[PDB]
DNA sequence: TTCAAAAAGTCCCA
DNA sequence: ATGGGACTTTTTGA
């Protein structure tokens, strides 16, 4: 995974552009990820650049035989350069490269093959640079992953990243006043899995810099968002993070010859943040948005964890054993007791849901094999070999047969408000028809308790408002280009308020539904309603 | 027993 | 061929 080499530059040059060489001529730099040496590679640059413009102070000041400029080739490996990597013939590749920078004496290279968190650390770094690997819960083999829940517990639970864990080496082996710089995923910004990762990186280092690149694609034919942290171990009270968040995620990484003109250009904005005032959330947002947020959060007196029930939809475990189109003639087989309406997160528009094209088999209502062979052999036994190779049916716990996450069916033959787990925009509907889905829509439904307070139709006319949707997005888990995380870590958490424009705001969401539901609908008429009820939301919140 | 999180997404076309 | 757009499964720890 190359990493883009205006980015490499940048990264070293903020770990060493203002190194006093003299006071030290011998900083130790590292890369626990260095690969073919794509950062060790540009600081052997920088640091023989810098070498050779005080080679005569240097040569004043200590040895004066020592410093020369033959001699910094020979230093720079010797007490300067280290990296580490798993694999062999990259550290290979490595060796001959920075050896080809100029036997004499067969100088030393500071390069270890091994894994860069099993290894014992014999002394600490003056700067740490480079691209972790990123592997998630599902990639990552479970042997490895039973080390890491038991040495990185600090940092890696659940449904962690790996590159928490270099996270928290590159933190624990860098030097008091040390620079660390990396390129990292962006998602532990936002995540529930980054929790513990947030408070490490807060209390233990000071973080100079954060570069978002939201859902610009970084690196090319690699579906990752990418952030730059840069981070010391300095003593110092200030404790303000410089934030250059991208303002055009369709902007191209090469426009200008270093990064630095991209971050102080029109295609960037740059906001600070007091880390001291950092809670378990990071809200990286400007004056603007944070007053905006601020007054939303302080105006709603509920949220919506308060008032309904969440849940995800149906996992089955495997779509195709269970899922058929409306017209399949194999439905024909299955009793209409057994069939559910079935949706995907595109049937969800706001306010409504388009009609259904797909049906579920509720397998787990089938008593027996021997009273609906039929079922079984011709539809859900074709893909048999792979429903028994799921983790429940591997342990007895669910039949082959069976949804591997059957939920309750109680909770969805109901009238409820479904939403996709990822999109653009807030796209918050009423459900009429019963209608089932997999884990990408979430679902909730209004507490009984609270609906005297809250309709549904109220609820999706103003989390369909252009403020609630900037509100959401404000603390919202960035994924891709145009792409937001629905998911109910987040969205329970929204605050609603209820005030003297409820029965207004209502009764123009009813209108919405109105037109919405009509054969011919007069879509122009719905925007204007919207934006009347924008006004109204507006209005209830002062902004 | 059984919840919900997780993009080095995935697949496609021009 | 690559880059950009539409769309989103089930494995997994707790
Ligand atoms: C996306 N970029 C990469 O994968 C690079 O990083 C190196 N890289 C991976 N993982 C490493 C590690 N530890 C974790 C580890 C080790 C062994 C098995 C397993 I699963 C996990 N330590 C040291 N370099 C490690 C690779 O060799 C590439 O150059
Ligand atoms: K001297
Ligand atoms: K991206």
């Given at each position: 995974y190359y990493t883009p080499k205006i980015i490499v530059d940048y990264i070293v040059k903020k770990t060493?552009?203002?190194?006093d060489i003299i006071k030290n001529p011998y900083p130790r730099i590292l890369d626990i990820s260095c690969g073919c040496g794509n950062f060790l590679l540009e600081v052997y640059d920088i640091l023989y650049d810098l070498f050779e413009e005080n080679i005569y102070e240097l040569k004043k000041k200590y040895d004066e035989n020592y410093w020369t400029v033959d001699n910094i080739h020979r230093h720079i490996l010797n007490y300067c350069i280290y990296g580490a990597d798993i694999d062999e013939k990259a550290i290979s590749i490595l060796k001959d490269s920075l050896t080809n920078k100029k036997d004499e004496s067969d100088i030393k290279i500071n390069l270890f093959c091994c894994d860069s968190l099993k290894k014992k650390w014999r002394y600490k770094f003056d700067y740490i640079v480079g691209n972790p690997p990123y592997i998630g819960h599902k990639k990552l083999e479970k042997k490895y992953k039973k080390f890491l829940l038991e040495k990185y517990s600090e940092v890696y639970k659940?449904?962690?990243?790996?590159?928490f864990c270099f996270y928290k080496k590159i933190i624990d082996i860098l030097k008091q006043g040390g620079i660390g710089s990396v390129i990292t995923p962006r998602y532990f910004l936002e995540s529930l899995s980054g929790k513990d990762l947030r408070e490490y990186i807060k209390s233990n280092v000071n973080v100079q810099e954060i570069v978002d690149f939201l859902?610009?694609?970084?690196?090319?034919?690699?579906?990752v968002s990418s952030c730059i942290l840069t981070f010391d171990k300095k003593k110092?009270?200030?404790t303000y993070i410089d934030v250059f968040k991208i303002?055009?995620?369709?902007?191209?990484?090469?426009?200008?010859?270093?990064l630095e003109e991209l971050l102080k250009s029109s295609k960037f904005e740059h906001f600070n943040i007091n880390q001291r005032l950092?809670?378990?959330?990071?809200?990286?947002?400007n004056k603007d948005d944070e007053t905006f947020y601020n007054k939303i959060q302080e105006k709603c007196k509920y949220s919506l964890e308060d008032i309904a029930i969440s849940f995800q939809g149906?996992?089955?475990?495997?779509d195709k054993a269970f899922i058929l189109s409306?017209?399949?003639?194999?439905?024909?087989?299955?009793?209409?007791?057994?069939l559910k309406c079935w949706i995907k997160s595109?049937?969800?528009?706001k306010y409504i849901v388009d009609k259904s094209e797909y049906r579920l088999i509720?397998?787990?209502?089938?008593?027996?094999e021997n009273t609906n062979k039929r079922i079984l052999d011709e539809?859900?036994?074709?893909?048999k070999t792979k429903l028994e190779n799921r983790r429940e049916c591997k342990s007895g716990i669910?039949?082959?047969?069976?949804?591997?996450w059957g939920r309750e069916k109680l909770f969805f033959e109901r009238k409820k408000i479904m939403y996709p787990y990822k999109s653009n925009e807030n796209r918050f509907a009423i459900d009429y028809d019963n209608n089932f889905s997999s884990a990408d829509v979430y679902s909730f439904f209004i507490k009984e308790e609270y609906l005297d307070k809250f309709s549904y139709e109220y609820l999706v006319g103003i989390l369909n408002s252009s403020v609630y949707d900037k509100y959401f997005k404000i603390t919202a888990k960035k994924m891709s280009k145009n792409i937001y995380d629905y998911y109910p870590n987040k969205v329970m958490k929204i605050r609603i308020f209820r005030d003297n424009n409820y029965e207004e705001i209502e009764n123009l969401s009813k209108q919405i539904i109105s037109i919405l539901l009509n054969?011919?609908?007069?879509k122009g008429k719905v925007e204007k309603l919207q934006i009347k009820m924008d006004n109204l939301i507006m209005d209830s919140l002062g902004i």
């Open positions: 060493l552009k203002n190194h659940d449904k962690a990243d790996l590159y859902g610009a694609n970084i690196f090319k034919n690699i579906g110092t009270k200030e303002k055009n995620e369709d902007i191209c990484i090469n426009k200008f010859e270093t950092l809670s378990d959330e990071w809200i990286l947002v149906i996992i089955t475990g495997c409306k017209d399949d003639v194999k439905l024909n087989l299955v009793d209409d007791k057994f595109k049937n969800i528009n509720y397998s787990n209502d089938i008593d027996n539809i859900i036994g074709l893909y669910r039949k082959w047969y069976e949804l591997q054969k011919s609908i007069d």
